[PDB]
Design a protein around this ligand. Structure first.
Ligand SMILES: Nc1ncnc2c1ncn2[C@@H]1O[C@H](COP(=O)(O)O)[C@@H](OP(=O)(O)O)[C@H]1O
Ligand SMILES: N#Cc1cc2ccc(O)cc2oc1=O
Length: 288
């Protein structure tokens, strides 16, 4: 493991994800599919759990039928010993929830032709960066992230798995212009999850009772999801993920980046960020 990244169409990737793209070429989307798309560490699991509960009518015992990574197939996923997004998906009953981090340049065209509904979650880049740094350590398939300063440097030039956060959040934002895309923010979800959930409920067309929403709002909170082995990844083998080094469910906070970023890193990050997100309507909250 810890192989360096491989590049495909300008997108750096973990070697195994890269290979995954082959079999991923045969994939056929259905009109009733729903795609969960985020830049890594931006709240994929949060919203996956939310979405699956909606798909099970709120029943909690049904959501414990299997790991979230089995309930929500990971499109580009493939790893040494353990089913590939494509396998797991063969036994996946419709309507299907699917997970991806792929930028548009790599996204299977079938998804756009079938006009598949997309739920996109964005998070502030500073928190994403810190989160991703910690994730790199614990998720052993990735290259050495190095020191934090070193990793922060790569993250600014997009030399991390999945490429530039700046390109990802902006390209799906423009797609939303003209594809059914619910475009959400991690920090809004943090602020008032109930509100975000109604948005999701509306988006997917379903409608659920208050009692049921508050129910979901609470079994989708960080602590509950941190408790639940069907969401905390603690059944994924040690070799792929060691939660000792760092939990998948680490902090779940907005503003955590302030205890990692140095003042110098912050000033340099802010200056470069301006340049890159210039002429863009996207407006992020670094803190609540
Ligand atoms: N229910 C929840 N509420 C808030 N944050 C959550 C959450 N479940 C997971 N997260 C956080 O989302 C990040 C991982 O997202 P993804 O699923 O996209 O990889 C981690 O952030 P931290 O590293 O800040 O803890 C994780 O703690
Ligand atoms: N190896 C590996 C993994 C990479 C990975 C990347 C993104 C993600 O959301 C979940 C992931 O889970 C993994 O097990």
């Amino acid at each position: 493991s810890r192989q360096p990244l491989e590049y495909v169409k300008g997108v750096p990737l973990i070697k195994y994800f890269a290979e995954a793209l082959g079999p991923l070429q045969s994939f056929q989307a259905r009109p009733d599919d729903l795609l969960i798309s985020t830049y890594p560490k931006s709240g994929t699991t949060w919203v996956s759990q939310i979405l699956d509960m909606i798909y099970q009518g709120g029943d909690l015992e049904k959501c414990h039928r299997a790991p979230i990574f089995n309930r929500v197939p990971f499109l580009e996923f493939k790893a040494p010993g353990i089913p590939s997004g494509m396998e797991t998906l063969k036994d996946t009953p419709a309507p299907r929830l699917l997970k991806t981090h792929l930028p548009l340049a790599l996204l299977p065209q079938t998804l756009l032709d079938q006009k598949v509904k997309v739920v996109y979650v964005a998070r502030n880049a500073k928190d994403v960066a810190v989160s991703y740094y910690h994730f790199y350590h614990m998720a052993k398939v990735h290259p050495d992230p190095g020191t934090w300063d070193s990793f922060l440097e790569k993250f600014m030039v997009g030399e991390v798995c999945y490429g530039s956060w700046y390109q990802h959040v902006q390209e799906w934002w423009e797609l939303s212009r003209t594809h059914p895309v619910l475009y959400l923010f991690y920090e809004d979800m943090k602020e008032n999850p109930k509100r975000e959930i109604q948005k999701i409920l509306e988006f997917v067309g379903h409608s659920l009772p208050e009692e049921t929403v508050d129910f979901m709002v609470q079994h989708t909170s960080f602590k509950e999801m941190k408790k639940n082995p069907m969401t905390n990844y603690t059944t994924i083998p040690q070799e792929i993920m060691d939660h000792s080094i760092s939990p998948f469910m680490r902090k779940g906070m907005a503003g955590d980046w302030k205890t990692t970023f140095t003042v110098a890193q912050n000033e340099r990050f802010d200056a470069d960020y301006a340049e890159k997100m210039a002429g863009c309507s996207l407006s992020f909250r670094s803190e609540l």
